Amino acid sequence: VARGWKRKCPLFGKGG
Amino acid sequence: KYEITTIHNLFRKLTHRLFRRNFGYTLR
């Protein structure tokens, strides 16, 4: 049930 | 604001829907 860490490349990546 | 979503993912007891409804709906 993990789609926010496997799809969020630019987000979880450097978006933070 | 993602660490709290990744750490809670291991907490089956903790209701986490912002990972797919907030961090997942983005797909759309």
Helix (H) or strand (E) holding B3: helix B3-7
Within 8 A by CB and 6+ apart from B1, the residues are A16
User: What are the distances in angstroms from CA A12 to CA B13, B17, B23?
Assistant: 24, 17, 9
Chain B CB contacts of A4 under 8 Å are 2, 5, 19-20, 22-24, 26
End-to-end CA distance of chain A: 21
Q: Which residue type, as a one-letter code, is found at position A12?
A: F
Here the tokens at position B3 are 């660490």
In the three-class reduction of DSSP (H, G, I as helix; E, B as strand; rest coil), residue B11 is classed as: coil
Say if residue B10 is exposed, middle or buried (CB neighbours under 10 Å; 0-12, 13-18, 19+).
exposed
Residue recorded with tokens 């490349």: A9
Here the tokens at position B27 are 């797909």
- Rounded distance between C-alpha atoms, residue B15 and residue A11, angstroms: 22
Chain B CB contacts of A2 under 8 Å are 9, 19
The method recorded for this entry reads NMR
